[PDB]
């Protein structure tokens, strides 16, 4: 079982079940229409979260984590744990598109 030099890939920590302490059940929403729920620790930081996001085939840069309603843009904390920012009970999501530009000109004082 010695294979070539294969390409490199980044992978999601299994799953916790549904029995397992300190979970909560959070349910990614794509703007195509489609739901995905899985659960995860409540000891997990909101970092993880951008992964499990850029293996659906969505990057972070181009979209982001949400709150359900009342809705509001969430950004995830390097240090505050799930949990912590909020997501102590099971919550839904929803990736929306990050606030870009490809122009400019104009300028504010």
């Not at 739901?35 to 972070?60: A, C, E, I, P, T």
């Not at 509001?72 to 839904?92: F, K, M, P, Y």
């Amino acid at each position: 079982g010695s294979s070539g030099s294969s390409g490199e890939v980044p992978d999601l920590p299994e799953e916790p079940s549904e029995t397992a302490e300190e979970v909560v059940t959070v349910a990614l929403r794509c703007p195509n229409g489609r739901v995905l729920r899985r659960r995860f620790f409540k000891s997990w930081n909101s970092q993880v979260l951008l992964d499990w996001m850029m293996k659906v085939g969505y990057h972070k840069s181009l979209y982001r984590l949400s709150t359900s309603f009342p809705r509001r843009a969430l950004e995830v904390e390097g240090g505050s744990s799930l949990e912590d920012i909020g997501i102590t009970v099971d919550t839904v999501l929803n990736v929306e598109e990050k606030e870009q530009s490809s122009q400019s000109g104009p300028s504010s004082g």
